[PDB]
Structures are given as structure tokens and as C-alpha cells.
Design a binder for this molecule. Structure first.
Ligand SMILES: [Mg+2]
Ligand SMILES: [Mg+2]
Length: 115
RNA sequence: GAAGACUGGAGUGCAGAAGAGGAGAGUGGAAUUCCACGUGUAGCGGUGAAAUGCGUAGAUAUGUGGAGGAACACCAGUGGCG
């Protein structure tokens, strides 16, 4: 019995996580690639992202909602599968906003690999 | 070498110009970490594959607030100063 939810998709090189929340920040249900029962490196596949997004949409619809807002972060490739699954589950999306955090030359990054 | 004479060298005068040149004091935003509190449940992280590791004493995620330190995205350019 909540409308106007928000979806947070965190898709990285190793996993993807979908958070469904109210318009304020209180979570309702969540689903991750490993929560579906997947193995390790297989979590990065966009197929697992599609499955996780479908599961999150179904769990959100169990309590019922109509519209949704999409926030984007992470460098993973499971983004498109997640957003298309959210579209196909019956939820309309007002807009997609990217919230990938970029610093203004803040803390130094860890050293490059194979050195 | 000595005594004179002259401005091309050199320097001063007068009028403008540009610059991350140097020292001192104060301030700003983005982000990371830690702490406290709401929502929420079983994984998160990582790799060529894994595992050590954190997590039901309740993470990862998300919202609010607080503490502190370091570095200054776009401008940015075989551009500039020494
Ligand atoms: Mg001259
Ligand atoms: Mg938190």
C-alpha cells in the first residue's frame, strides 16, 4: 500500500544489487545476484542482473506499487538488464539519474595491479 | 698606460601588460573512513578461478546527523612563471 517508490541499482564488476525503497529512504525489499543462489564470478553476468531485478520487482509488487525512480551507480555491465527488467515488470519509470560518486581529487586510490 | 670626447653594450627614468614565482593567516565544496539513530533481510567483498576476511551479537544497501585528516574534478591548452 505504498506508491511512488525509488529503485537503487548498484552494479559493479563483481555483483549487482537492487534496493527498493519508499520516497524517503526506508527500504521495502531487496535482491542481489548472489541472493538468487548464484555462484561467484557468475554474479557479474547481466543475466543474473536481469534475474535480480525481476525478483526485486516481484517482491515490491507483493506489497504493491505503481511508479518508480531509478538511481544509477557502479561501473558494471548489468545496468541495462536491470532497467529493462524493471520496465518489463509493469513499473513505469519517470527518469533515470546517475549518482556515481566522483571526488574532486580526494583520497589517493590504491596502487595499480601487476606492479 | 695617462688625459679627453660619443652612445650601439649596460643600467635608471616615464607609460602600459601578463603570469600555478615565494612566505604568512583565514575560508570552501565533492569524496573516503569512523560513530549514533530510522527501514530492511541473508548474504557482502574478491579473483583467471578461489579462499582468507566482514555478517543473524545483523551486515552489504538506503536516509538523517556528528568527528577528523589529506588532496584540490570541470577551467586544462608540445598554455604560463622561475
Ligand atoms: Mg638598451
Ligand atoms: Mg549505513
Amino acid at each position: 500500500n505504498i506508491e511512488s517508490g525509488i529503485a537503487h541499482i548498484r552494479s559493479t564488476f563483481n555483483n549487482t544489487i537492487v534496493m527498493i525503497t519508499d520516497t524517503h529512504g526506508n527500504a521495502l525489499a531487496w535482491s542481489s545476484a548472489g541472493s538468487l543462489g548464484f555462484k561467484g564470478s557468475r554474479k557479474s553476468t547481466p543475466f543474473a542482473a536481469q534475474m535480480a531485478a525481476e525478483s526485486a520487482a516481484k517482491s515490491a509488487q507483493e506489497h504493491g506499487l505503481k511508479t518508480l525512480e531509478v538511481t544509477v551507480k557502479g561501473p558494471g555491465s548489468g545496468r541495462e538488464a536491470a532497467i529493462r527488467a524493471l520496465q518489463a515488470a509493469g513499473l513505469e519509470v519517470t527518469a533515470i539519474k546517475d549518482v556515481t560518486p566522483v571526488p574532486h581529487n580526494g583520497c589517493r586510490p590504491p596502487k595499480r595491479r601487476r606492479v
